[PDB]
Scaffold this active site. Structure first.
Site, short mmCIF file in Angstrom:
data_model
loop_
_atom_site.label_atom_id
_atom_site.label_comp_id
_atom_site.label_asym_id
_atom_site.label_seq_id
_atom_site.Cartn_x
_atom_site.Cartn_y
_atom_site.Cartn_z
CG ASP A 44 83.25 24.80 99.48
OD1 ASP A 44 83.49 25.88 98.99
OD2 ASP A 44 83.71 23.71 99.06
CG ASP A 56 80.29 18.42 109.21
OD1 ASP A 56 80.30 17.38 109.94
OD2 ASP A 56 80.79 19.55 109.50
#
EC number: 3.2.1.17
Length: 129
Positions: free
Chosen positions: A52, A48
């Site tokens: 994280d 994307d």
């Protein structure tokens, strides 16, 4: 640092997370092992273009600001760098808002995959409460 198993269990204990929303302490500490391997500085890059971060792998496309993720929101209202800090307060504060959303603990993929529907109390055994 890397947390000891029982060290983390009392950390998230004092943060008010046992039976939070119905999810026992075990469900939180179990998540942490497969999300981050108890590492406070763990990070991952998704395709994307989001990131994280931290002990519970809170993704930046929804929850935190790192200035590297285009057209995204900041629901927990924190910089993503705070999820890397050795004190787990900002990670707990945000996760409480994530779990409340409506999907519960299914927000974490390593939880869903490795932790849901298992003997979640093995995870707390040995430690002193």
């Amino acid at each position: 640092k890397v947390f000891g198993r029982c060290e983390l269990a009392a950390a998230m204990k004092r943060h008010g997370l046992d039976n939070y929303r119905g999810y026992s302490l075990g469900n939180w500490v179990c998540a942490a092992k497969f999300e981050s391997n108890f590492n406070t500085q763990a990070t991952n890059r998704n395709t994307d273009g989001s990131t994280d971060y931290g002990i519970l792998q809170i993704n930046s496309r929804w929850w935190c600001n790192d200035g590297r993720t285009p057209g995204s929101r900041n629901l927990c209202n924190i910089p993503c760098s705070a999820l890397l800090s050795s004190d787990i307060t900002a990670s707990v504060n945000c996760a409480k808002k994530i779990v409340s959303d409506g999907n519960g603990m299914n927000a974490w993929v390593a939880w869903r995959n490795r932790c849901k529907g298992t003997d979640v109390q093995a995870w707390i055994r040995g430690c002193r409460l």
